[PDB]
Amino acid sequence: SIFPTRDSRDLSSRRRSLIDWEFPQMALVPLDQVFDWAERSRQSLHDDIVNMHRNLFSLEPFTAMDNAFESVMKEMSAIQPREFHPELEYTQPGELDFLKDAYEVGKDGRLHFKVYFNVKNFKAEEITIKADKNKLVVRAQKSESVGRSIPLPPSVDRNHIQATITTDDVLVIEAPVNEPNYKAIKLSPEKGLAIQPSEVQERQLAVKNKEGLEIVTAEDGSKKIHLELKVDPHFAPKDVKVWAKGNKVYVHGVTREFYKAFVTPEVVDASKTQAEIVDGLMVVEAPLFK
Amino acid sequence: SIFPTRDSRDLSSRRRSLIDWEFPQMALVPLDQVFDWAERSRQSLHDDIVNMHRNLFSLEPFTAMDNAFESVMKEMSAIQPREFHPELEYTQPGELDFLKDAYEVGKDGRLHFKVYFNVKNFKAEEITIKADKNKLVVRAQKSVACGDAAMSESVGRSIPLPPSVDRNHIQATITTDDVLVIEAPVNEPNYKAIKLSPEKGLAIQPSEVQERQLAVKNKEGLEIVTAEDGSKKIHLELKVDPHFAPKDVKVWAKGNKVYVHGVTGHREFYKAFVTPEVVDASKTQAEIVDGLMVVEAPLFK
């Protein structure tokens, strides 16, 4: 048997404390997604492993490799933001397209950024890893250093980056993502990480009567894309998915069907994307980084 | 500038381990469900609190109250399981109907069993709480006067306590406005299928699976299946029109009664069944694959 304890608040207030509480699952990938992901992942386990090894980032002559990376970023920043036919333009795989598949749930249930490097013939002591601004750098030294530099979205937690080399020589680098849009996340094999718009009563994303792509300035100087699309009212939230492929944003609805796409001069921080479709007008916003 | 550590596993071993992992959220109420709950809960906090106070369990002369409880459970055990019209029969409030709303998310994100008791005129130290078999027992008792050992007659209240509720983690708290709150998490409820709503309380949404996990005894209707060990569960089979998608059907309990509702587009149906024992609702399972829905839920007395 046991004895109760006195509280300090009435019923009402104790129930209010519960109502406004920060439940753990609000900071974890939704159960349905994790379940579906786990299910299909074991069915393709053997092939996915084979493909992972087949697509490991290789380490190349550092200096040359790093400049090539800088020119890519530099060139990209010269793109003029515009809309394009998703099925006709940019159909060729792009340099930053791997970011689409860099997100995966971790054992802690949170969303994580994970990338894989081939480090065969190198020892852990010969490998350094740095995160400066929005680029991750892997450098190995035996004669000159070899390495790899890649975009590292701002949302990836720099204080919790982990790095281990498997027995089959795969450098794994991962870190959780801070504050991704958990409620809207959809994990799919194709799109990788997409978000589903929410039907709201009170919009949280400012409408601006500007139909199309815009690129504004977040509440702190940084940039972010703003899209306004007029879509048939016969489209429900569950019929629409927004996703990113490097510096490109794709929107696809099917119930009736549409497919839009936009290229920008910066990389899209996908897991932080937000979309609210209501009254035939869907507005998408997502942070951008370079 | 960090340096990597060498692991003891190969890549595929690590992956297989992640895939079969027991993710935290697989033991928590689904995010959307919690979100929607809190959303509408604040929208109706006032009224909800009114009704709660108006429906608090009271403590009564212990011996009498306990006899009454055994009586009610005895009468119930004599019920002949059968289907009944959900809108025209068992329309009056029942003794175990509170169970439909005893389920609620807790701060730890798990599904909890929560019951409230009016405990005015009692100090937290005068109240005792214990779990005996499948019943929750609350007993209070105060002295008659200061300086004398004599006690007043014990008052109390006993209620059905589903087997799934965790006996080792019961917590009891008395508010400032005299409402004894008793909570406890539920062990392994059907988290993925849970649908919370004020009207149905805790409902289950059947799943469309390729591999039927529940048995098909090829016979429509309700059936009380008894296992070698003595355990009992309800097994319900229903042929439903193919136009009904899993998301169009909901199953839920109200004490010793089970309700099934389906509506799509435009067609709908509404069936109900009464049993001689209490349903352990959160443990309910339902799968509807190609016209045949099967529902199984543990029974208990």
Q: Length of chain B in residues, anyone?
A: 301
Q: How many whole angstroms from its chain centre is CA A13?
A: 38
Residue A25 lies in a domain: yes
3-state SS class at B156: strand
Q: At B50, is the secondary structure helix, strand, or coil? A: helix
User: In terms of domains, do B171 and B106 share one?
Assistant: yes
Cβ atoms A215, A223 nearer than 8 A: yes
* Contact assessment for residue B247 and residue B267, using Cβ atoms and an 8 Å cutoff: no
According to DSSP, the residues that pair with B143 across neighbouring strands are B151
Q: Residue B7, SS3?
A: coil
Could you tell me if residue B4 is inside a domain? no
Q: How close is the nearest chain A Cα to the Cα of B293, in Å? A: 21
Residues A90 and A184 in one domain: yes
Q: Which of A141, A159, A178 is the last residue of a domain?
A: A178
Give Cα separations from A138 to A55, A132, A135, A163 (angstroms). Answer: 17, 11, 10, 11
Looking at the structure, tell me whether residues A254 and A113 fall in a common domain.
Answer: no
In a domain, B2, yes or no: no
CA torsion sign, B73 to B75 to B79 to B83? negative
- Nearest chain B alpha carbon to A167: B10
Q: Provide the pairing of β-strand B285-289 with B292-300.
A: antiparallel
Asked whether A83 and A262 are in contact (CB, 8 A), the reply is yes
Closest C-alpha to A114, from A99, A96, A134, A129: A99
Q: Name residues whose C-beta falls within 8 Å of residue A125's C-beta, 6 or more positions apart in sequence.
A: B3
**What number of other Cβ atoms are within 10 A of residue B44's Cβ?**
12
> Which domain-ending residue is among B169, B187, B205?
B187
Please, which experimental method was used?
Answer: X-ray
In a domain, A234, yes or no: yes
**Rounded distance between C-alpha atoms, residue B108 and residue A271, angstroms:** 25
What residue type is assigned to position B24 of the chain?
Answer: P
DSSP three-state, residue B29: coil
Q: How far apart are CA A259 and CA A89, in angstroms?
A: 13
Burial, A144: exposed, middle or buried (Cβ in 10 Å; 0-12, 13-18, 19+)? exposed
Show the tokens assigned to A270: 């996908």
Is residue A1 in a domain? no
DSSP string, B158-198: EEE--TTB-GGG-EEEE-SSSEEEEEEEBSS--GGGEEEET
In a domain, B3, yes or no: no
Using DSSP, state whether B18 is helix, strand or coil. Answer: helix
In one-letter notation, the amino acid at residue B230 is G
In the DSSP assignment, the letter for residue B78 is: T
DSSP annotation of B291: T
> Encoding tokens for residue B11?
């890549």
Residues A194 and A90 placed together within one structural domain of the fold: yes
Task: Judge whether B1 lies within some domain.
Answer: no
Phi, psi of B219 (to 5 degrees): -170, 120
Q: What is the CATH number of the domain that holds A248?
A: 2.60.40.790
- Measured in Å, how far apart are chain B's first and last C-alpha atoms? 62
Contact list, A11 vs chain B (CB under 8 Å): 49, 52-53, 116, 175, 177, 179, 181
Domain termination site, one of B187, B219, B242: B187
Strand pairing report for B103-105 and B111-118: antiparallel
My answer on whether A205 and A267 are in the same domain is yes
Please name the residue of chain A whose CA is at the shortest distance from the CA of residue B127: A3
User: Which amino acid is residue B76, in one-letter code?
Assistant: M
Cβ–Cβ gap A30/B34 under 8 Å: no
Closest CA to B137 of B101, B77, B105, B180: B180
Q: To the nearest 10°, the Cα dihedral for B64, B68, B69, B73?
A: 150
- Best of B5, B19, B166 to substitute, by most chain A Cβ atoms within 10 angstroms, is B19
Please tell me which of the candidates B35, B42, B129 has its beta carbon nearest to residue A4. Answer: B129
Print burial letters for B7-39: b (CB count within 10 Å at least 16), e (below 16). beeebbebbbeebebebbbbbbbbbebbbebbe
Q: Which residue of B has its CA nearest to A106?
A: B18
Query: Is residue B9 helix, strand or coil?
Result: coil
Tell me the C-alpha to C-alpha distance, in Å, between residue A129 and each of A135, A167, A171, A267, B1: 11, 19, 11, 22, 6
Whether A169 and A272 map to the same domain: the answer is: no
**Same domain membership, residue B15 and residue B139:** no
- How many domains is chain A partitioned into structurally? 3
Scanning every residue of chain A, which has its alpha carbon at the shortest distance from the alpha carbon of B169? A2
**Whole-angstrom distance, CA of residue B54 vs CA of residue B284:** 30
Do both B201 and B272 map to the same domain? yes
Report d(CA B115, CA B90) in Å as an integer.
Answer: 23
Residue B279 and residue B169 in one domain: no
DSSP class per residue in chain A:
-B--EE-SS-HHHHHHHHHT---GGGGS--HHHHHHHHHHHHHTHHHHHHHHHHTPBPPEEHHHHHHHHHHHHHHHTTPPPEE--TTTSS-SPPTTGGGGG-EEE-TTSSEEEEEEEE-TT--GGGEEEEEETTEEEEEE-----EEEEEE--TTB-GGG-EEEE-TT-EEEEEEEBSS--GGGEEEETTTEEEE--B--SS--SPP-S--EE--EE-TTS-EEEEEEEE--TT--GGGEEEEEETTEEEEEEE--EEEEEEE-SSEE-GGG-EEEEETTEEEEEEEEE-
- Point out the residue among A10, A21, A164 whose CB comes nearest to the CB of B176: A10
Candidates A16, A124, A171; nearest CB to B45:
A16
Q: How far apart are CA B108 and CA A50, in angstroms?
A: 39
Check if the beta carbon of residue A225 is closer than 8 Å to that of residue A281.
no
* E strands in chain B: 5-6, 60-61, 82-83, 103-105, 111-118, 127-132, 135-140, 155-160, 171-174, 179-185, 194-197, 201-204, 221-226, 232-239, 249-253, 257-264, 267-274, 278-279, 285-289, 292-300
Q: How far is the C-alpha of B238 from the C-alpha of B219, rounded, in Å?
A: 8
**A184's tokens:** 């809207």
Is the same domain home to B158 and B236?
Answer: no
In a domain, A214, yes or no: yes
DSSP annotation of B100: G
Q: How many CB atoms lie within 10 A of CB A39?
A: 10
B103/A25 Cα distance (integer angstroms) = 18
Burial label, A168 (beta-carbon count in 10 A; 0-12, 13-18, 19+): middle
CATH assignment of the domain containing A65: 6.10.20.50
Among the partner residues A29, A166, A168, nearest to B25 by beta-carbon distance: A29
Domain match, A187 and A266 both? yes
As a whole number of angstroms, the distance between CA A108 and CA B26 comes to 11
User: Taking Cα atoms as reference points, which of B235, B229, B243, B244 lies closest to residue B212?
Assistant: B235
User: How many whole angstroms separate alpha carbon A206 and alpha carbon B75?
Assistant: 61
| Closest-approach residue (CA) in chain B for A171 | B4
Same-domain check for residues A169 and A225: no
Q: Of B161, B224, B214, nearest to B187 (Cα)? A: B161
Name every chain A residue with its beta carbon within 8 A of the beta carbon of B28.
23-25, 28, 31
Tell the burial category of B210 from Cβ atoms under 10 Å away from its Cβ (0-12, 13-18, 19+): exposed
Residue A231 contacts residue A241 (beta carbons within 8 Å): no
Cα–Cα dist B71/B84, whole Å: 24
Contact A286, A99 (CB under 8 A): no
In angstroms, rounded to a whole number, what is the distance separating the alpha carbons of residues A92 and A90?
A: 5
Q: Are A19 and B128 within 8 A, CB to CB?
A: no
For residue B170, the one-letter residue type is I
* Domain of A232, in residue numbers: 79-94+179-290
Closest chain A C-alpha to B298 CA, distance in angstroms: 24
